[PDB]
Design a protein around this motif. Structure first.
Motif, PDB file in Angstrom:
ATOM      1  N   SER A 158      32.929  59.841  63.859  1.00 44.45           N
ATOM      2  CA  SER A 158      32.770  58.551  63.196  1.00 44.45           C
ATOM      3  C   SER A 158      32.470  57.452  64.212  1.00 44.45           C
ATOM      4  N   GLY A 159      31.416  56.684  63.950  1.00 39.62           N
ATOM      5  CA  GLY A 159      31.041  55.609  64.849  1.00 39.62           C
ATOM      6  C   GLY A 159      30.588  54.367  64.109  1.00 39.62           C
ATOM      7  N   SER A 160      31.089  53.210  64.534  1.00 36.37           N
ATOM      8  CA  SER A 160      30.736  51.945  63.902  1.00 36.37           C
ATOM      9  C   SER A 160      29.715  51.184  64.742  1.00 36.37           C
ATOM     10  N   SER A 161      28.488  51.101  64.237  1.00 35.53           N
ATOM     11  CA  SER A 161      27.418  50.404  64.941  1.00 35.53           C
ATOM     12  C   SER A 161      27.519  48.897  64.730  1.00 35.53           C
ATOM     13  N   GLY A 162      28.726  48.363  64.887  1.00 37.14           N
ATOM     14  CA  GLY A 162      28.936  46.938  64.709  1.00 37.14           C
ATOM     15  C   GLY A 162      30.306  46.491  65.178  1.00 37.14           C
ATOM     16  N   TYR A 163      31.284  46.547  64.280  1.00 41.26           N
ATOM     17  CA  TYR A 163      32.646  46.140  64.606  1.00 41.26           C
ATOM     18  C   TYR A 163      33.656  46.852  63.712  1.00 41.26           C
ATOM     19  N   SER A 164      34.894  46.944  64.185  1.00 41.85           N
ATOM     20  CA  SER A 164      35.954  47.604  63.431  1.00 41.85           C
ATOM     21  C   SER A 164      36.440  46.717  62.289  1.00 41.85           C
ATOM     22  N   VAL A 165      36.189  47.155  61.060  1.00 43.35           N
ATOM     23  CA  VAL A 165      36.601  46.403  59.881  1.00 43.35           C
ATOM     24  C   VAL A 165      37.756  47.095  59.164  1.00 43.35           C
ATOM     25  N   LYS A 166      38.891  46.408  59.084  1.00 45.20           N
ATOM     26  CA  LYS A 166      40.071  46.954  58.423  1.00 45.20           C
ATOM     27  C   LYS A 166      40.669  45.939  57.455  1.00 45.20           C
ATOM     28  N   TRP A 167      41.422  46.433  56.478  1.00 48.94           N
ATOM     29  CA  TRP A 167      42.054  45.568  55.488  1.00 48.94           C
ATOM     30  C   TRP A 167      43.555  45.464  55.734  1.00 48.94           C
ATOM     31  N   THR A 168      44.208  44.563  55.008  1.00 45.83           N
ATOM     32  CA  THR A 168      45.645  44.364  55.149  1.00 45.83           C
ATOM     33  C   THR A 168      46.354  44.499  53.807  1.00 45.83           C
ATOM     34  N   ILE A 169      47.613  44.919  53.846  1.00 45.79           N
ATOM     35  CA  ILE A 169      48.401  45.088  52.632  1.00 45.79           C
ATOM     36  C   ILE A 169      48.152  43.947  51.652  1.00 45.79           C
ATOM     37  N   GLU A 170      48.323  42.717  52.128  1.00 44.10           N
ATOM     38  CA  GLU A 170      48.116  41.540  51.293  1.00 44.10           C
ATOM     39  C   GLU A 170      46.773  41.616  50.570  1.00 44.10           C
ATOM     40  N   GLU A 171      45.741  42.037  51.293  1.00 49.74           N
ATOM     41  CA  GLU A 171      44.405  42.153  50.720  1.00 49.74           C
ATOM     42  C   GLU A 171      44.336  43.313  49.731  1.00 49.74           C
ATOM     43  N   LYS A 172      44.921  44.444  50.112  1.00 49.94           N
ATOM     44  CA  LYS A 172      44.928  45.627  49.260  1.00 49.94           C
ATOM     45  C   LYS A 172      45.612  45.334  47.928  1.00 49.94           C
ATOM     46  N   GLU A 173      46.733  44.622  47.987  1.00 52.29           N
ATOM     47  CA  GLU A 173      47.481  44.276  46.785  1.00 52.29           C
ATOM     48  C   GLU A 173      46.691  43.305  45.913  1.00 52.29           C
ATOM     49  N   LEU A 174      46.019  42.355  46.555  1.00 50.17           N
ATOM     50  CA  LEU A 174      45.224  41.363  45.839  1.00 50.17           C
ATOM     51  C   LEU A 174      44.029  42.016  45.152  1.00 50.17           C
ATOM     52  N   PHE A 175      43.299  42.837  45.899  1.00 52.02           N
ATOM     53  CA  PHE A 175      42.131  43.525  45.361  1.00 52.02           C
ATOM     54  C   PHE A 175      42.468  44.221  44.046  1.00 52.02           C
ATOM     55  N   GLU A 176      43.568  44.967  44.043  1.00 49.86           N
ATOM     56  CA  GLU A 176      44.000  45.685  42.849  1.00 49.86           C
ATOM     57  C   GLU A 176      44.292  44.717  41.707  1.00 49.86           C
ATOM     58  N   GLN A 177      45.202  43.779  41.952  1.00 45.42           N
ATOM     59  CA  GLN A 177      45.572  42.793  40.944  1.00 45.42           C
ATOM     60  C   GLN A 177      44.352  42.345  40.146  1.00 45.42           C
ATOM     61  N   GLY A 178      43.367  41.786  40.843  1.00 45.59           N
ATOM     62  CA  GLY A 178      42.161  41.324  40.182  1.00 45.59           C
ATOM     63  C   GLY A 178      41.352  42.461  39.591  1.00 45.59           C
ATOM     64  N   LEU A 179      41.312  43.586  40.297  1.00 45.93           N
ATOM     65  CA  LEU A 179      40.566  44.752  39.836  1.00 45.93           C
ATOM     66  C   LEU A 179      40.971  45.133  38.416  1.00 45.93           C
ATOM     67  N   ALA A 180      42.275  45.126  38.158  1.00 46.23           N
ATOM     68  CA  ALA A 180      42.794  45.466  36.838  1.00 46.23           C
ATOM     69  C   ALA A 180      42.640  44.298  35.870  1.00 46.23           C
ATOM     70  N   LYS A 181      42.994  43.103  36.331  1.00 48.82           N
ATOM     71  CA  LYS A 181      42.895  41.905  35.507  1.00 48.82           C
ATOM     72  C   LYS A 181      41.440  41.598  35.166  1.00 48.82           C
ATOM     73  N   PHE A 182      40.655  41.269  36.187  1.00 47.59           N
ATOM     74  CA  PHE A 182      39.244  40.952  35.995  1.00 47.59           C
ATOM     75  C   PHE A 182      38.441  42.212  35.684  1.00 47.59           C
ATOM     76  N   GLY A 183      38.903  43.345  36.207  1.00 47.51           N
ATOM     77  CA  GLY A 183      38.217  44.602  35.977  1.00 47.51           C
ATOM     78  C   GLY A 183      37.442  45.071  37.192  1.00 47.51           C
ATOM     79  N   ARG A 184      36.296  45.703  36.954  1.00 50.82           N
ATOM     80  CA  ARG A 184      35.462  46.206  38.039  1.00 50.82           C
ATOM     81  C   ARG A 184      34.515  45.121  38.543  1.00 50.82           C
ATOM     82  N   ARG A 185      34.959  43.871  38.462  1.00 55.49           N
ATOM     83  CA  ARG A 185      34.150  42.742  38.909  1.00 55.49           C
ATOM     84  C   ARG A 185      34.416  42.432  40.379  1.00 55.49           C
TER      85      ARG A 185
END
Length: 72
Positions: free
Chosen positions: A3-30
């Protein structure tokens, strides 16, 4: 495998993971909406991650790739 990233290391954080879901279910697949909610991430990052999350949820399958390698 490799695995190689031809740019930069992009990672997420718990806070972001939890937020993504919240809206994912509420707003949906938007993504346009979610991305905004978090603010930190962008429609793009979210779009991809969306599939990245599930991929993990279920142990490697379709990929058929194992962390194993030549022993010795």
């Amino acid at each position: 495998g490799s695995s190689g990233s031809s740019g930069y290391s992009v990672k997420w954080t718990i806070e972001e993971k939890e937020l993504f879901e919240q809206g994912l279910a509420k707003f949906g697949r938007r993504w346009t909406k979610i991305s905004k909610l978090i603010g930190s991430r962008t429609v793009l990052q979210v779009k991809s991650y969306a599939r990245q999350y599930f991929k993990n949820k279920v142990k490697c399958g379709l990929d058929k790739e194992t962390p194993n390698q030549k022993t010795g």
